[PDB]
Amino acid sequence: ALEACPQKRGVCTRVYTTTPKKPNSALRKVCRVRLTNGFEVTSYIGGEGHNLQEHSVILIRGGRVKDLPGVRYHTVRGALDCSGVKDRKQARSKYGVKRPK
Amino acid sequence: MVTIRLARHGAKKRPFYQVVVADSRNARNGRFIERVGFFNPIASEKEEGTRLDLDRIAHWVGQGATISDRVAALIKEV
Amino acid sequence: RTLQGRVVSDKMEKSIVVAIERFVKHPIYGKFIKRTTKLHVHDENNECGIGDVVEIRECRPLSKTKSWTLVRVVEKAVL
Amino acid sequence: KSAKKRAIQSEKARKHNASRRSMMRTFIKKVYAAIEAGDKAAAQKAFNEMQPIVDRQAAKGLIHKNKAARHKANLTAQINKLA
RNA sequence: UGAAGAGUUUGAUCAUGGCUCAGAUUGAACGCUGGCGGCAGGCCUAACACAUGCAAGUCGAACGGUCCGGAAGAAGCUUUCUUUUGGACAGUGGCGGACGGGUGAGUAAUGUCUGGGAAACUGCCUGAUGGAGGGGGAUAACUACUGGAAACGGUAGCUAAUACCGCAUAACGUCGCAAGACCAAAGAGGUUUUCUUGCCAUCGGAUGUGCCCAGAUGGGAUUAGCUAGUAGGUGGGGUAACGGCUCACCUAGGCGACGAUCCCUAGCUGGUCUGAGAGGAUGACCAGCCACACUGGAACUGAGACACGGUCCAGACUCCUACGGGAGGCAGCAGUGGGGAAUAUUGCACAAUGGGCGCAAGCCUGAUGCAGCCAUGCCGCGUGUAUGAAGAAGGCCUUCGGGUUGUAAAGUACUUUCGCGGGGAGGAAGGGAGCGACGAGCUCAUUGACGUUACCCGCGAAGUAGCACCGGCUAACUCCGUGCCAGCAGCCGCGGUAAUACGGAGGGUGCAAGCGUUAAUCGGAAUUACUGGGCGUAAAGCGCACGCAGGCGGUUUGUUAAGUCAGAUGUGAAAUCCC
User: Is the CB of D52 under 7 A from strand E?
Assistant: First the structure.
């Protein structure tokens, strides 16, 4: 976070997929982000589906992914272009998903 | 200019003025030179409304200490 | 103020430098520490010489560096 | 009021004290010059025209106390010498 | 009256070691979840750029006109016009803007902190002494004319003061020698021969400051020799004053491992938080000090600003413009836009308290006193409180026996919200008027919230509710689906047909809008350990000799007694820490 700030914005450079380590196997969704801090780190994309393109621009939280060595940050869904998960009945507090009527 | 006015301890539902001799420059509730008594507008806390302590102020009076209009009234009441 | 020191130099005229030393405890450890200071005392009579442990008292600043003057000589010599 | 009035006076004010000190350094040098030459009479007489003028400047905010007494002491100290 | 940590390196154990977890705080926020009420609080990100309004005036007991208002005249009425008078705007004249308010960039330095010293100053105010005689001179307003689009400016004429200047008296003060000479000063107003306001000179007081000194004040030497006015002397210049502060001459020193110089960072402090203490971190609200207002530099006038609404010069920007030339700069209040995860009414008002000016009347005062928006926090009520059937439904859990939610899951009443009506606080009384010399003092009246909130009284409807989590640490369970499949995970791990850690459902725990979560600060770590530690094998003794500084060092006596110790006194910044 550099300035030790809770959150930091950044423009995505590429929204590619990565595979877990030895004990796991899947297609975890990540994306390189150029935070305003001047650093280009990779953040994980929580949820079963996102809508992040090339000019996504999403706020970074900060969390290490035991599966993906390097991804020490998590994306905050529900802020900016990062649309919250759809039909999220459970984790709405996270991923940012308004309670259906 | 050394003046003798009232120092408002003023608090939500607690009006108490402290007739003190201090410099005119200093704030109303700043560092004072020496207290000579007190004043209770409502006189509810204690029966003794005010305690001028004549002899005390009698010293500053003439030393160059001037008393305000309001305080003068309380002081005159002795 | 009276200070005691040594005459480590008598090169200048009417001006002698006295090396005063003191012992103070460390603000943290507390152990005694040695600290000295050079003071240019006045000596119009050029009486005091090198090796003389004289007394120093505060007087009218004869100059910018000299604000002290010779009072009395404790001993005779100890280079 | 007119913030300019206080501006013009201050400027013209310096113009005054400027001429006053002029007479000072003009006659003070004259006295010293006379003393240096040896002329006693003409000198002292010229000294009695510098003492007042410098004292009069003290009456106002021209030379003030201190600096005024200084010049008087120095002048009289430079005349009793070369004389 | 003061001290209980845990998880993770092994197949297992001990030792070492780093990381990590719950605590308090922060001028916040995003994600999803909303009722109310008191109190408190709000751009911690771009000193980024800013629309609009506001942020200092006040005096006619200084002087001529205009505007507004009243009264009395010449007149039969009207027009017109005359005199007197109140307020004030324009001008002239006096005082004030360097107080208050905002911000923290810059800054390591007696800048600040603590105690002293003196080569000093101090408007208004207070005490004491003395005095105020005669005279002369100048510039506006106004009047006339001309130039310009405007700002604004040029010329000619008249004129006054508590505006300037020359001479006396000297209480005194200053200067040489030693124990002599020189140098001051404006009235006005009235209940006017009596006071009031003010002035000139001197001493002192009060208060506020300039300057100097001892000690203390972050990180790095992969920053070490550095320095020419640079160190000292004489004389001079300069200033309110000491000082190479500045100049000439002479001398040639001065400083450094008790680390100068250089570089980096940060307003500082009191304090705040934490801790048994020591100590660590921080210093945001409030109080003191310092520094800074378009960027940079400088000077003047003054008691004091080298001075936001003062001035001069350099640079950039925005706006106006018949482009000739001008007007500004909210890191002042509110507010806008941008940025950002993000932080509000371009609201109301002066009576109170306090401040500036005035004799007073009185005027000014978004300083401030309140309201509004946002649960951001805290206090008495988030998803309810109390009441309630051996309990026939529904939601939840289940060993399918049962159990649980038990206003019913219906209702009803509620703490009593909300809402409506009335009264309406100060937790402060004057201004004014009457008595008194509109002085002291006494008496009386008006004005209530801030150009109506709080609280009290009356009336009165029940009047939303959701999120996180349930393998262990973490308090809280199984069935079904899927099946190393999909997925969970801070660490140890779990899932290959019984998975409480995957998705769903019933049930349960937490929060009771907080609780979780994210970020930031402190200790536990006796893992720098002064109190609390180690170096044969775990990280760790220099290969040896010798030797400088330094540290330490036998015994006896005397003086000094600087260190050390003791009594008294001054300061102990204030605030706080502690009680």
Answer: yes
DSSP string, C45-65: T----TT--EEEEE-S-SSSS
Place of tokens 């505060």: C58
| Maximal CA-CA distance, chain C | 45
Take residue B76 and report the two structure tokens written for it.
């005159």
Total residues belonging to chain A = 101
Q: CA-CA distance, D48 to A10, in Å (whole number)? A: 88
Pairing assessment for the beta strands A28-35 and A73-74 based on DSSP bridges: unpaired
What DSSP line would sit under A33-99, residue for residue? EEETTS-EEEEE--SS-----TT----B-----SSSTT--EEB-TTSTT-PPPSS-SS--TTTT-PP
- Chains in touch with A (3+ beta-carbon pairs under 8 Å) read none
CA distance B54 to A77: 75
Residues 6+ apart with CB under 8 A from B31: B22
CA distances to A5, A9, A49, C32, C48 from A58, rounded to whole Å, are 15, 6, 15, 62, 83
| C57: Cβ contacts below 8 Å, ≥ 6 apart | C1, C2, C3, C68, C69, C71
Q: Which residues 17-76 in chain B have a CB closer than 7 A to strand E? A: 23-28, 30-31, 33, 41-42, 62-64, 66, 68, 70, 72-73, 76
Residue with tokens 């004043």: B39
What whole-number distance in Å separates Cα of residue A36 and Cα of residue D6? 56
**For D72, phi and psi rounded to 5 degrees?**
-60, -45
For this PDB entry, the determination method is cryo-EM
Q: How many C-beta atoms lie closer than 10 Å to residue A54's C-beta?
A: 11
